[PDB]
């Protein structure tokens, strides 16, 4: 069947209806890959973190995320190469939209009842977003900043509503502000773990804290 | 335009005069209306409001 | 044909028109359902205390 226009399912009209054992017969989401670019770079390689944040409360159709993801990748890749960035599609397609299946054939009024038992069958998936929630997060080196904003600008155009390109003060995908993460990385409380980093807590078994973070204890002692 | 907590123009709901036609039974009420009003004795007030009772409310003694 | 199934509109208006009123609790509630063992006492205890006050009244 022809895909219904996104104008119909724009708003958060219905309560969440996710894939569960009560929601059995549903198709799969169009978006499957959520992390793109040089996704396995360490945290320091990509200091700057940019977010594409929705300013309104609507539903992002699952495939609209896939549609914007290919566009955001494609400008970014061809401008600064394959591995100059790492974009993460934060929000996920869990809300399963419903379609009431209809017959529009000649004289379909006979074979179909209209609104009797009009509970809709699953039509697709969409991502529920509220105001201020991040849609896209790209992390890259700071000189790449013009490219990622423009690349995010092209991705904004696949989304309904208004979205904002905000230059987050955090150090990449971390939860730490730039000047004070530098203090933390310098003091040596940070071990990479493939793509993200480990923090040393003031609480814990000191022997394990020593196992993971020998450099902190050496740095203080020295 | 005021709110009305209770029902307005609500009759007191009690018999004020014997709605029997009996003239003699109205003479007694005329006498006791004067006594109930012109005395402080609660007894006259009681008998005055017992003369108005209907036949079912004035059972034989 | 198709009539509205249920509507509690104006239901609380109606109840409060005559006022929602307590059952006007009285002293000495009914000994109804009270423990039959206890009740079969209270007959005798009252029977004893009445004659005791009667004898006291002489």
């Amino acid at each position: 069947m022809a895909r219904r226009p996104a104008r119909c399912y724009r708003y958060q009209k219905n309560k969440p209806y996710p894939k569960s054992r009560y929601n059995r017969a549903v198709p799969d989401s169009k978006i499957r890959i959520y992390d793109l670019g040089k996704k396995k770079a360490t945290v320091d390689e990509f200091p700057l973190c940019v977010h594409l944040v929705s300013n309104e409360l609507e539903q992002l159709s699952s495939e609209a995320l896939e549609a914007a993801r290919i566009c955001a990748n494609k400008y970014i890749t061809k401008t600064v190469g394959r591995d100059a960035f790492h974009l993460r599609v934060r929000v996920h397609p869990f809300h399963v939209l419903r379609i009431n299946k209809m017959l529009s054939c000649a004289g379909a009024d006979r074979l179909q009842q209209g609104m009797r038992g009009a509970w809709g069958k699953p039509h697709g998936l969409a991502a529920r977003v509220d105001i201020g929630q991040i849609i896209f997060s790209v992390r890259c080196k700071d000189v790449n900043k013009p490219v990622v904003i423009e690349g995010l600008r092209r991705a904004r155009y696949k989304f309904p509503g208004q979205q904002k390109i905000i230059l987050s003060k955090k150090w990449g995908f971390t939860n730490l502000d730039r000047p004070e993460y530098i203090k933390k990385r310098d003091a040596g409380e940070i071990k990479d773990d493939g793509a993200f980093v480990k923090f040393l807590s003031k609480k814990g078994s000191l022997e394990k804290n020593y196992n993971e973070f020998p450099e902190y204890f050496q740095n203080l002692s020295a | 335009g005021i709110d009305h907590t209770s029902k307005q123009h609500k009759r007191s709901g009690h018999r004020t005069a014997p709605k029997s036609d009996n003239v003699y039974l109205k003479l007694l009420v005329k006498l006791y209306t004067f006594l109930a009003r012109r005395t402080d004795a609660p007894f006259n007030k009681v008998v005055l409001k017992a003369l108005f009772l209907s036949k079912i409310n004035r059972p034989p003694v | 044909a198709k009539s509205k199934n249920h509507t509690a509109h104006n239901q609380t208006r109606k109840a409060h028109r005559n006022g929602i009123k307590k059952p006007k609790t009285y002293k000495y509630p009914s000994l109804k359902g009270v423990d039959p063992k206890f009740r079969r006492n209270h007959k005798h205890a009252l029977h004893g205390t009445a004659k005791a006050l009667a004898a006291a009244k002489k």
Partner: protein
């Protein structure tokens, strides 16, 4: 269709609290209930025999009957334009003493106590409670406490 069984819509009213499942603490059967006591109803779901209906959970009423293992509670009930009286067969596992009434009782002993000394000396001992009165005047000194000014903070994304 539609169901209104004896215990419908009780997915969470008869759940035992977190880490409070299992055996009822043994003080429950030890509390003594006398006719006239004011008790509330909180049906611990663990004990299935003698549960109250889900309407009475939280309803506080007096005890009118005391039985081997149960007590009889009177609860007023909203039915149309009148309150009905509901006498309930309640296992003591589902009830506990009301702490509201004992607060009033201990106050009464406090009122009687201070009235007793008021009989000797100090008439007009002001029995009745007083709500929070408007605060009286006072002097606010500034020794070491100069009023430090504030300014509204500029908007920052903070993200």
């Amino acid at each position: 269709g539609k169901s209104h069984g004896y215990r419908s819509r009780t997915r969470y009213m008869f759940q035992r609290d977190f880490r409070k499942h299992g055996a009822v603490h043994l003080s429950t059967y030890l509390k003594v209930y006398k006719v006239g006591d004011i008790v509330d109803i909180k049906a611990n779901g663990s004990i299935q025999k003698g549960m109250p209906h889900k309407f009475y959970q939280g309803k506080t009423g007096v005890v009118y009957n005391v039985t081997k293992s149960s007590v009889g509670v009177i609860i007023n009930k909203m039915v149309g334009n009148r309150y009905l009286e509901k006498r309930l067969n309640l296992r003591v596992e589902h009830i506990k003493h009301s702490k509201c009434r004992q607060e009033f009782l201990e106050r009464v002993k406090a009122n009687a106590a201070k009235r007793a000394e008021a009989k000797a000396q100090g008439v007009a001992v002001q029995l009745k409670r007083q709500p929070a009165q408007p605060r009286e005047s006072r002097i606010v000194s500034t020794e070491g406490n100069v009023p430090q000014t504030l300014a509204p903070v500029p908007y920052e994304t903070f993200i």
